[PDB]
Amino acid sequence: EPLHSIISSTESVQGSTSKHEFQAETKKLLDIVARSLYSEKEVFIRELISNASDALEKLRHKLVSDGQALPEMEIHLQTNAEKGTITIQDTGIGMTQEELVSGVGFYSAFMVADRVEVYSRSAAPGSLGYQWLSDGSGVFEIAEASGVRTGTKIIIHLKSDCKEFSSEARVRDVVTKYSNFVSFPLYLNGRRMNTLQAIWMMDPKDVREWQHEEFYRYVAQAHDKPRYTLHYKTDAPLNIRSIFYVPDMKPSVALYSRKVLIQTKATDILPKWLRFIRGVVDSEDIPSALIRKLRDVLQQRLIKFFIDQSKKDAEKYAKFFEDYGLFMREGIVTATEQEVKEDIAKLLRYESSALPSGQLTSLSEYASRMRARNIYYLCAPNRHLAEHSPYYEAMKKKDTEVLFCFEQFDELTLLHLREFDKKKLISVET
């Protein structure tokens, strides 16, 4: 496909640049970001793009609010080999003189640059354009520039061992690494980059199956379909935009922040027993501490979800328990103190003496058909042998209901559980 160029030197400076010493706080901050902080250095590409989005949205918003039309709202990257530069321009809202004089991920630029050169023109009516110059140490210069398009153009003059970010290939890799889901069109050297839609940001109402399937296949790198889907948004405990998938196939969740990738392989935002879940979690509250915060609410709502699933459909949950009950048992055993154990145990389903043999039941359901109070269960090789066990018959005219485990790990699980809400766990062999 033919090329889309919106990057050229249309800017000039007529007068002199006013030199300006940076505030004590902000130098310290600046080469904290440039020297101390980010592990990966590539992420500057990620942060600038992030800014490039924000501005753009606030352009759209304003315009859409005022009721006036929309210009070409795009993000562009260009790499120059001989000049050793990388440039990112966005046609979003701009920057007043004030803002310039006074996004912070921006400073990550100086991780890779020996000098940074910015041109910016506010979208505000009548706004003038400006040139901003810095070498990354306490001093920057500001001129009034002309031929600055509305939006912001950032030119990075790369360091020596940082010039790898001048090759279209490398930059392409970084871009598709952290930014397949950027909301506005993104071009590298004239060529469109991303195509994927952050459907997790949408209204759960508005995403249909075909999509959820697409995304499922992307983040799970799978070819089956999600047997289960949970689109969870919340603003109360923490900021969360997430989607969770349970595969058709029998036997990881990516962590994004504002449609931007933080960690693809992020197995700390969910309990180890919920590792069979696929999908995405997006939280603004993210740079191990808070991840704990997050993960806890994630676990509780996923438990909630599967409980609701048992109710909304019994048989499909039966197959789900057959294929994924391993993780639930393991997670019950692993859980440190009781409350969590019981919570996860609300997901277990087993046969009953009363129920027709095939039919299943949670401990919860067992506790209602009860008389006010104790559990009873039994590992036996099958139903036949179980309800023919003299221990069960012993339990004929005591008019008591007993659960049937047919595998040792089931009974070991019920044993470890010790008890479940105000009733205690005991086999009919004691």
Ligand SMILES: COc1c(C)cnc(Cn2cnc3c(Cl)nc(N)nc32)c1C
């Ligand atoms: C000139 O350099 C900056 C200074 C000194 C402080 N913050 C920002 C980030 N930033 C603030 N508003 C921005 C908009 Cl509208 N767009 C972009 N891409 N970055 C912005 C930039 C780029």
